[PDB]
């Protein structure tokens, strides 16, 4: 050994009674620790630093277990030293793991799998090593106050000094040019501040007289919109840092000709759903955020949801009410779940966050507010409605809370009673006062716009009056910022008129009609004289598929402007920004007109600048897309139609996610014609990346569509009990998925490995524990979402399903192959079992890039034209009989 038989202790973050953590180290094989929740790990302190040579683990039974062992010599960093990932059963002899004489004062054992239960266990753990004579070192989470930073000095300088602020802005608009099209095009522009045009945001583009482009605008985003206007209408250039670009500039800067002056009737152009921060932006670095804000300003956006670094604000707030930093970390979710954590739906899951997290994200948020200030983009910060942890009373006995029940199998945080009786302590007032103060401490006065949404998708209003709740929440927000505007989401008829009528100051609230392009609900808001924004939702969960509503955008936005007195803006509220760039380009365009436009000729113009060129055939393919996947519909529907490939296998499947659809409302063979045309023009257009993007989009749409048809043939073949029929069609079905995987390999944005690597690398000098945990977050979100009770009982299984390379191969295909094998076995042998899908899915979720399989961050050289012809030939609906 030698075995460390003394001074060793252990902690855990949950257990089923009375299977406490100490039962893992009590020398007794008949006693065990057992997990109760999603913290499936224990932490052994060794009473000093040892050089470990061996670690021995015993489980309570003969099930197959999988786990990862991490160690620390500094008490801060936990690095992986051992793991079990083989399918061998536990037995009476235990598992012995050799350690490379690694210095360790603490150990973590994360038992990520148990073949017999959702719940995990360690009966005993023995650690063998050589005592170093040393002891683990002492360090507390500490963050800077905004006012004490270079950010505050800069922020105030912009605020007080007009000439400085203008210089800063103009220089930023110029840096934007250098980032977007290249440094060599920067001095080809002259940027000027002008006034508003009758109280409206405005830009101008004209010729300087010496071959440069002169652009005027009342602020940053107006300038960047003039820049984009020039690129789009004169340079035939189209920028989308997420969904494909044409950035090929002419040899000479083209002349503007006659001067243009373009204003917008809208006070706000809005961007972001709480969900975007999770489904898309979870693992974004500053570079990705910088890109995004350039694209924002260029698209006219001046109002943007901002929850970056809100974990520090909450930490400082909770610290005042009896919570340690560790307890705060247990409250807050992991980095993929902030959407539903800030919307009061869930706690804990994916966590705990590393100690490093707090400072890094406060800094990222300060960085973002600096650029936003330069552009004149208002962030929407956080308001406070009463959200507290479920043990808030234990720590603050006089506090009055309301249990909020569950959300999709998760426990919702409590909610402080917004008001109490006389003679009762008012903890809404105490905690709200701290919250707004700590939010100032972390970021300063950066905005008058605050977002909070009590009772989002459920909860419980207890004994309280609905209107009185919304009266007090607003009054309190205005208390700490007299100019405050409470940004309120409008989702599925909530908040009701009765909550909304509680708003005593209508000017200081702004309601986001979240789903205005499928299900508008602004009439109720307009009738109550409430300022409101018209929003395109479009995207649910980052689910992919050809789908957009260009005609409604072209018509309904200007029509709403004319039919109303309280529409203060338009915007986007997608759950992910990863799909259908047409929709988002058209919506932000609709801000700069009071008249309806022609969606058909708009598209004709759009595709030319996107591909860099156009022709008769490419146009007619896009008309086919407009006539099919993009055709105006009048039904209710959430998201693009879902692919059967991404569905949990079975009979009578009508979607992949619980409240989704797989119904194709257009003619499939008609849509396939677009792919024929794209393939026919491939060689001419392959120099365009945005063309390849769209080709991959419609081609993977073609194969999703045909897969559905093939699935029904093979289902009919089994239900008719033969047989070698089934083998054939089931085999052609799996072959189709293998072709799909090749299609998806062509796009960097469709690679699972990019999502995952971004998770593992988003902070620097992270230990293996943090990287592994963040990869858990990335895997789980796009698949099971949560654990068994969240995936199954909760309805969240495959909610965020992705048509992604690697994921399709190792997860979607694998599910379908097992089920086929399957039915075949029976049809020949009998009979086919019930497959416990979650088990199989969570197997993949818990795999790690460094020990299991590293997914590529690099696209393939596969030929889409060629791939398209293979699709038309063998895997199409058009040729489906042959």
Ligand X SMILES: CC(=O)N[C@H]1/C(=N/OC(=O)Nc2ccccc2)O[C@H](CO)[C@@H](O)[C@@H]1O
User: Can you give the binding site for ligand X, defined by CB under 6 A?
Assistant: 273, 275, 340, 343, 457, 491-492, 514, 540-541, 575, 638, 659, 796, 799
Tokens of 121: 């266990």
Shortest CA distance to 402 belongs to which of 382, 421, 419, 383?
A: 419
Of 8, 14, 22, 26, which one interacts with Ca ion (CB under 5 A)? 26
- CB 57 → Ca ion: shortest distance, Å? 11
Q: Is 28 in the site for Ca ion (CB under 5 A)?
A: yes
- CB 345 → ligand X: shortest distance, Å? 7
- Determine contact, residues 786/796, Cβ cutoff 8 Å: yes
Closest to ligand X by CB, 410 or 711: 410
Residue 7's CB is within 10 A of a number of other CB atoms, namely 10
- Determine contact, residues 571/515, Cβ cutoff 8 Å: no
Closest to ligand X by CB, 295 or 337: 337
Q: Which residue, judged by CB position, is nearest to ligand X in the bound state?
A: 659
- CB 734 → ligand X: shortest distance, Å? 30
- CB 42 → Ca ion: shortest distance, Å? 12
The binder of 491, among Ca ion, ligand X, none, by C-beta within 5 to 8 A per type, is ligand X
Closest to ligand X by CB, 23 or 537: 537
**Interacting span for Ca ion (CB under 5 A) from 31-39, 150-158, 696-704, 800-808:** 31-39
Q: Which residue, judged by CB position, is nearest to Ca ion in the bound state?
A: 31
Q: Is 651 exposed, middle or buried (0-12, 13-18, 19+ CB in 10 A)?
A: exposed
Per CB under 5 A, which of residues 112..151 are in contact with Ca ion?
A: 124
Closest to ligand X by CB, 457 or 627: 457
Closest to Ca ion by CB, 67 or 685: 67
- Determine contact, residues 216/194, Cβ cutoff 8 Å: yes
- Determine contact, residues 580/543, Cβ cutoff 8 Å: no
- Positive or negative, the CA dihedral 4, 7, 13, 18 is positive
- Determine contact, residues 33/24, Cβ cutoff 8 Å: yes
Number of residues that bind Ca ion (CB under 5 A): 5
- CB 759 → ligand X: shortest distance, Å? 18
Alpha carbon 645 to its chain's center: 22
> Which positions ≥6 away from 339 have C-beta within 8 Å?
273, 274, 275, 276, 277, 278, 279
Q: What number of H helices and E strands is found in the chain?
A: 29, 25
Q: Is 758 in the site for Ca ion (CB under 5 A)?
A: no
Closest to ligand X by CB, 226 or 409: 409
The binder of 441, among Ca ion, ligand X, none, by C-beta within 5 to 8 A per type, is none
- CB 337 → ligand X: shortest distance, Å? 10
The binder of 256, among ligand X, Ca ion, none, by C-beta within 5 to 8 A per type, is none
CA distances from 737 to 673, 742, 819, 872 (A): 21, 9, 14, 14
The binder of 28, among Ca ion, ligand X, none, by C-beta within 5 to 8 A per type, is Ca ion
Beta-bridge partner residues of 379: 304
Closest to ligand X by CB, 541 or 649: 541
Closest to ligand X by CB, 456 or 771: 456
The binder of 691, among ligand X, Ca ion, none, by C-beta within 5 to 8 A per type, is none
- Positive or negative, the CA dihedral 521, 527, 528, 532 is positive
**Interacting span for Ca ion (CB under 5 A) from 29-37, 237-245, 435-443, 839-847:** 29-37
Q: Is 140 exposed, middle or buried (0-12, 13-18, 19+ CB in 10 A)?
A: exposed
* Matching residue, tokens 């400072």: 359
What is d(CA 56, CA 122) in angstroms, rounded to the nearest whole number? Answer: 10
The binder of 273, among Ca ion, ligand X, none, by C-beta within 5 to 8 A per type, is ligand X
- Determine contact, residues 689/244, Cβ cutoff 8 Å: yes
- CB 395 → ligand X: shortest distance, Å? 29
- Determine contact, residues 24/94, Cβ cutoff 8 Å: no
Closest to ligand X by CB, 460 or 492: 492
Per CB under 5 A, which of residues 427..466 are in contact with Ca ion?
A: none
**Interacting span for Ca ion (CB under 5 A) from 28-36, 42-50, 655-663, 720-728:** 28-36
Shortest CA distance to 290 belongs to which of 217, 375, 232, 207?
A: 375
Tokens of 42: 């224990």
- CB 574 → ligand X: shortest distance, Å? 8
Closest to ligand X by CB, 636 or 833: 636
Of 14, 16, 20, 31, which one interacts with Ca ion (CB under 5 A)? 31
Closest to ligand X by CB, 338 or 776: 338
Closest to Ca ion by CB, 59 or 580: 59
The binder of 275, among Ca ion, ligand X, none, by C-beta within 5 to 8 A per type, is ligand X
- CB 661 → ligand X: shortest distance, Å? 10
- CB 114 → Ca ion: shortest distance, Å? 16
The binder of 23, among ligand X, Ca ion, none, by C-beta within 5 to 8 A per type, is Ca ion
The binder of 26, among ligand X, Ca ion, none, by C-beta within 5 to 8 A per type, is Ca ion
Planar angle of CA 611, 612, 615, nearest 5 degrees: 75
- CB 10 → Ca ion: shortest distance, Å? 10
- CB 388 → ligand X: shortest distance, Å? 21
- Determine contact, residues 783/845, Cβ cutoff 8 Å: yes
User: CA-CA-CA-CA torsion for 65, 15, 389, 360, nearest 10 degrees?
Assistant: -40
What is d(CA 31, CA 27) in angstroms, rounded to the nearest whole number? Answer: 9
- CB 523 → ligand X: shortest distance, Å? 19
Of 10, 23, 512, 867, which one interacts with Ca ion (CB under 5 A)? 23
Tokens of 774: 């963040």
Closest to ligand X by CB, 577 or 690: 577
Closest to ligand X by CB, 228 or 347: 347
Question: β-strands 124-131, 41-58: how paired?
Answer: antiparallel
Shortest CA distance to 855 belongs to which of 758, 738, 715, 711?
A: 758
Residue 423's CB is within 10 A of a number of other CB atoms, namely 5
- Determine contact, residues 369/446, Cβ cutoff 8 Å: yes
Alpha carbon 185 to its chain's center: 34
- CB 511 → ligand X: shortest distance, Å? 14
Which residues sit at the interface with Ca ion, rule CB under 5 A? 23, 26, 28, 31, 124
């Amino acid at each position: 050994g030698v075995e460390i038989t003394e001074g060793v202790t252990v902690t855990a973050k949950g257990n089923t009674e009375g299977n406490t953590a100490d039962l893992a180290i009590d020398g007794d094989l008949s006693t065990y620790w057992e997990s109760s929740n999603d913290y499936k790990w224990i932490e052994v302190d060794l009473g000093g630093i040892y050089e470990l040579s061996k670690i021995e683990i015993f489980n309570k039974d003969e099930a197959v277990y999988k786990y990862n062992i991490y160690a620390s010599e500094d008490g801060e960093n936990f690095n992986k030293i051992a793991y079990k990932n083989n399918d061998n059963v536990s037995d009476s002899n235990g598992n012995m793991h050799t350690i490379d004489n690694v210095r360790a004062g603490k150990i973590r054992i994360d038992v990520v799998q148990n073949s017999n239960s959702d719940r995990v266990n360690i009966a005993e753990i023995n650690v063998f090593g050589k005592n170093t004579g040393e002891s683990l070192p002492e360090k507390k989470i500490a963050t800077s106050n905004f006012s004490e930073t270079p950010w505050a000095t800069e922020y105030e300088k912009f605020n007080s000094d007009s000439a400085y602020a203008n210089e800063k802005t103009l220089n930023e608009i110029k840096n934007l040019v250098g980032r977007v099209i290249g440094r060599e095009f920067k001095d080809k522009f002259i940027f000027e501040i002008r006034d508003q045009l009758n109280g409206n945001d405005v830009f101008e583009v004209s010729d300087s007289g010496d071959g440069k482009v002169l652009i005027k605008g009342n602020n940053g985003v107006s300038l960047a919109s003039g820049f984009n206007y020039y690129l789009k209408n004169y340079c035939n250039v189209s920028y989308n840092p997420i969904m494909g670009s044409n950035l090929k500039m002419p040899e000479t800067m083209p002349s503007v000709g006659e001067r243009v002056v373009i204003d917008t009737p809208y006070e706000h152009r809005y961007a972001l759903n709480f969900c975007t921060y999770s489904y898309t932006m979870s693992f974004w670095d500053w570079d990705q955020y910088e890109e995004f804000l350039d694209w924002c300003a260029m698209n006219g956006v001046n109002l943007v949801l901002d929850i970056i670094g809100q974990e520090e604000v909450l930490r400082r707030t909770l610290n005042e009410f009896g919570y340690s930093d560790e307890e705060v970390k247990e409250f807050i979710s992991g980095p993929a779940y902030f959407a539903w954590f800030y919307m009061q739906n869930m706690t804990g899951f994916g966590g705990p966050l590393p100690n490093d997290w707090f400072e890094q994200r406060a800094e990222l948020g300060r960085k973002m507010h600096d650029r936003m200030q330069s552009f004149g983009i208002n962030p929407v910060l956080q308001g406070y409605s009463g959200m507290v942890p479920r043990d808030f009373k234990e720590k603050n006995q006089e506090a009055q809370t309301i249990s909020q029940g569950g959300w999709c199998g998760f426990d919702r945080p409590d909610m402080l009673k917004t008001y109490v009786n006389e003679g009762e302590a008012d903890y809404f007032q105490k905690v709200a006062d701290v919250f707004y103060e700590k939010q100032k401490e972390v970021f300063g006065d950066v905005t008058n716009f605050y977002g909070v949404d009590p009772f989002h998708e459920g909860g419980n209003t207890g004994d309280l009056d609905n209107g009185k709740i919304y009266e007090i929440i607003q009054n309190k927000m205005i208390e700490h910022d007299n100019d405050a505007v409470w940004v309120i989401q409008n989702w599925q008829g909530n908040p009701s008129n009765n909550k909304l009528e509680g708003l005593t100051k209508k000017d200081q609230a702004m309601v986001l009609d979240l789903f205005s392009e499928v299900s508008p609900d602004w009439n109720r808001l307009e009738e109550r004289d409430l300022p409101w924004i018209w929003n395109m939702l479009h995207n649910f969960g980052g689910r992919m598929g050809m789908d957009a509503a260009p005609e409604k955008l072209a018509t309904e936005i200007p029509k709403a402007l004319a039919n109303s007195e309280h529409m203060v803006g338009i915007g986007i509220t997608p759950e992910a920004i990863n799909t259908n760039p047409l929709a988002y380009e058209l919506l932000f365009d609709m801000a700069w007109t009071r008249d309806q436009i022609n969606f058909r000729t708009w598209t004709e113009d759009y595709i030319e600048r996107r591909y860099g060129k156009t022709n008769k055939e490419i146009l007619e393919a896009w008309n086919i897309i407009l006539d099919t996947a993009y055709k105006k519909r009048n039904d209710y529907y959430q998201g693009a139609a879902e692919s059967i490939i991404n569905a949990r296998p079975g009979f009578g499947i009508k979607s992949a996610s619980t409240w989704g659809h797989s119904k194709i409302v257009y003619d499939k063979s008609e849509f396939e014609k677009a792919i024929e045309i794209f393939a026919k023009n491939y060689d001419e257009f392959k120099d365009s990346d945005a063309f390849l993007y769209d080709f991959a989009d419609i081609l993977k749409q073609l194969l999703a569509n045909s897969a559905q048809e093939y699935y029904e043939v093979m289902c009919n073949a089994y239900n008719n009990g033969n047989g070698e029929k089934f083998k054939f069609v089931s085999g052609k079905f799996l072959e189709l998925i293998k072709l799909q995987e090749r299609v998806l390999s062509t796009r960097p944005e469709f690679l699972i490995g990019n999502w995952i690597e971004d998770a593992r690398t988003m902070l620097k000098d992270s230990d293996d524990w943090t990287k592994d945990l963040f990869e858990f977050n990335a895997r789980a979100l796009v698949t099971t979402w949560g654990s068994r009770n969240n995936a199954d009982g909760g309805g969240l299984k495959d909610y965020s399903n992705r048509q992604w390379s690697g994921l399709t191969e190792d997860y979607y295909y694998a599910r379908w192959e097992k089920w086929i094998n399957g039915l075949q076995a029976e049809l020949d042998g009998a009979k086919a079992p019930n497959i416990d899908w979650f088990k199989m899915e969570y197997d993949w979720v818990n795999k790690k890039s460094d020990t299991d399989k590293l997914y590529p961050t690099e696209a393939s050289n596969e030929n889409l034209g060629e791939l398209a012809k293979i699709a038309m030939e063998s895997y199409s609906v058009t040729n489906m009989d042959k």
